[PDB]
Design a protein around this ligand. Structure first.
Ligand SMILES: Nc1nc2c(ncn2[C@@H]2O[C@H](COP(=O)(O)OP(=O)(O)CP(=O)(O)O)[C@@H](O)[C@H]2O)c(=O)[nH]1
Ligand SMILES: Nc1nc2c(ncn2[C@@H]2O[C@H](COP(=O)(O)OP(=O)(O)CP(=O)(O)O)[C@@H](O)[C@H]2O)c(=O)[nH]1
Ligand SMILES: O=C(O)N1CCNCC1
Ligand SMILES: O=C(O)N1CCNCC1
Ligand SMILES: [Mg+2]
Ligand SMILES: [Mg+2]
Lengths: 290, 265
């Protein structure tokens, strides 16, 4: 079930006997190129195949009687591990406050409501916070999702200070015993210094225990710079990969995890609030390579 | 940066890196490099620019009165329509919008708020209303009231969802039922940060409703929008406008020379 280029790269070694390092090099070049065709950032794809090269050599690939299969298994296992190995979700505390952050259009508002529904069904009492005051009808959008999922939505006022947001959030959470606070932020470019500064100040005041970079699965090469900047300027604790019900390969997930070292917690698989499940590194590894 | 002036081998290696980093993709990158290697020219900077600018040509005047705006979830459709209204009202056109996104929460409201800010009328219906029936109504109002341009917003949809691509065909057919010449423009909106999936989006929207143009949004970001190169090469669809922000003025007619200059920076 591989992509055509990988099928050709691996397949042409089959039944041809033991390989030389020249054969390994030519194969790894094609693997690198396949990863780029799957939207893995070019630098991350290079680092990845360099790692694979040393692992395959260390597994004595040059003495293997089935080098095509050894290389393929090495790539798949390395990609699975590089994407996180196994599913992992955020550690719940008595009180949890998470930000959803990212680029314009990535899926943040929808994802906030999905997380609210997911965790309501696991005994939490969420509170949605509509902190996007710039996009027209942004607060109405989240209000309407909140109604759909049966979760309250505190709406931030135009011009409201982070300290006022904290005060109001703390009071509502205390009164109603809300223990998972999900803060939906406006989409922003990673190079928009004022808006990145605003987001960092909100984090400083609200003290989120997770800051989730919501990344569209169709994101290209810029995923590396985007994830790095959100991590350096704000601090990312994990990722949500959205719109995986499309056919984008999702290589950006590798770019983002490579530069942050942070887990991809969840996958978005529908427009519907029910369209969230844990991220399975194994599954995305197969999609990237397929 | 690409060392223009230096030796050929190092120019081509940084050019390759630059194109791939820009989301131009493997096939178009290789085509660009092969032609330049078989160029034999001392001013490589100008020869490369000329090849890329040639790949991207298959005030912007719509070919008719109705423009159907399509694209996947999140790309910038509704905002781009707002900007298009500002652009055309600045040229003296009588513009209206149809809030054809009757599916997503606050889709209609979002466009309605732009319409108020811009003094542009918006044809709207209740949530869940058939967008095809609404578009038909908007086209008959356009005709009866003598409007120059109608922009039809559509709900975000993934191109892998056959049923949603059919709904989009129904909207186009409804427009043509109201006015058999129309719509004379079907414009795909593509987010600049998109990788190689952009080409698949373009191919599938083109197969469904026949694109006459592409608008690339969010080019104020760091992404270069390079997947436009394989899109124009494959489908021969022209790039019409670029989005460069979140305000009503943040739209520019496509400028291939500047696009390519930015792509290589
Ligand atoms: N098919 C599908 N659509 C999704 C998924 N996640 C979000 N969407 C959709 O993508 C579009 C954008 O979602 P939205 O939640 O508004 O994104 P956002 O990042 O908050 C937009 P902004 O940056 O302006 O705040 C919506 O049409 C929505 O239904 C998903 O997992 N699958
Ligand atoms: N920085 C920047 N943001 C843009 C540009 N065009 C649109 N956006 C932004 O992207 C986000 C999504 O825009 P929107 O117009 O809602 O997109 P859409 O495709 O209609 C979303 P849906 O598919 O759900 O209907 C908004 O936050 C908006 O301000 C642009 O050129 N630059
Ligand atoms: O809710 C909290 O503040 N907690 C209690 C559970 N562990 C970490 C801190
Ligand atoms: O849960 C996951 O990680 N998925 C879901 C949909 N496809 C790719 C991976
Ligand atoms: Mg939002
Ligand atoms: Mg819209």
């Amino acid at each position: 079930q591989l992509s055509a280029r990988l099928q050709e790269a691996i397949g042409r070694l089959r039944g041809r006997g033991r390989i030389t390092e020249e054969d390994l090099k030519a194969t790894l070049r094609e693997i690198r190129r396949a990863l780029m065709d799957a939207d893995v950032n070019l630098e991350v794809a290079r680092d990845f195949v360099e790692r694979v090269r040393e692992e395959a050599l260390g597994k004595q690939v040059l003495e293997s009687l089935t080098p095509a299969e050894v290389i393929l298994a090495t790539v798949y296992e390395a990609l699975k591990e590089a994407l996180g190995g196994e599913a992992r979700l955020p550690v719940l505390k008595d009180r949890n406050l998470w930000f959803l952050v990212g680029l314009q259009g990535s899926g943040k508002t929808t994802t906030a409501a999905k997380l609210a529904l997911y965790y309501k069904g696991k005994g939490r009492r969420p509170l949605l916070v509509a902190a996007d005051t710039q996009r027209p009808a942004a607060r109405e959008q989240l209000r309407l999702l909140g109604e759909k999922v049966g979760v309250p939505v505190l709406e931030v006022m135009d011009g409201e200070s982070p300290e006022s947001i904290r005060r109001r959030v703390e009071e509502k959470a205390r009164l109603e015993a809300r223990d998972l606070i999900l803060v939906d932020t406006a989409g922003r470019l990673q190079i928009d210094e004022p808006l990145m500064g605003e987001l960092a100040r909100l984090k400083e005041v609200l003290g989120p225990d997770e800051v989730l970079l919501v990344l569209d699965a169709m994101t290209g090469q810029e995923a590396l710079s985007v994830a790095r900047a959100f991590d350096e300027k704000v601090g990312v604790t994990g990722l949500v990969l959205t719109k995986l019900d499309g056919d984008a390969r999702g290589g950006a997930a590798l770019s983002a995890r490579h530069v942050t070292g942070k887990p991809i917690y969840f996958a978005g698989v529908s427009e519907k609030p029910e369209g969230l499940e844990p991220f399975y590194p194994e599954r995305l590894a197969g999609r990237i390579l397929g | 940066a690409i060392p223009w002036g230096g030796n050929l081998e190092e120019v081509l290696e940084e050019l390759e890196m630059a194109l791939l980093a820009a989301d131009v993709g493997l096939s178009a990158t290789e085509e660009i490099l092969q032609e330049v290697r078989a160029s034999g020219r001392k001013d490589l900077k100008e020869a490369v620019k000329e090849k890329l600018v040639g790949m991207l040509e298959p005030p912007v005047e719509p070919k008719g009165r109705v423009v159907l705006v399509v694209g996947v979830n999140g790309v910038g459709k509704t905002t781009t329509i707002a900007k298009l209204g500002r652009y055309y009202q600045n040229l003296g056109k009588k513009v209206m919008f149809c809030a054809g996104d009757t599916f997503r929460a606050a889709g209609g409201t979002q466009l309605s708020e732009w319409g108020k800010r811009l003094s542009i009328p918006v044809i709207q219906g209740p949530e869940g209303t058939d967008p095809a029936a609404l578009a038909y109504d908007a086209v008959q109002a356009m005709k009866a009231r003598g409007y120059d341009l109608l922009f039809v917003d559509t709900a975000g949809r993934l191109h892998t969802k056959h049923n949603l691509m059919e709904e989009l065909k129904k909207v186009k057919r409804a427009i043509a039922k109201a006015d058999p010449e129309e719509p004379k423009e079907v414009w795909l909106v593509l987010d600049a940060v998109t990788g190689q999936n952009g080409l698949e989006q373009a191919k599938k929207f083109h197969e469904a409703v026949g694109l006459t143009g592409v608008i690339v949004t969010k080019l104020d970001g760091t992404a270069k929008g390079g997947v436009l190169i394989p899109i124009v090469r494959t489908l021969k669809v022209p790039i019409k406008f670029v989005g460069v922000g979140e305000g009503p003025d943040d739209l520019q007619p496509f400028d291939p020379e500047a696009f390519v200059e930015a792509l290589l920076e």
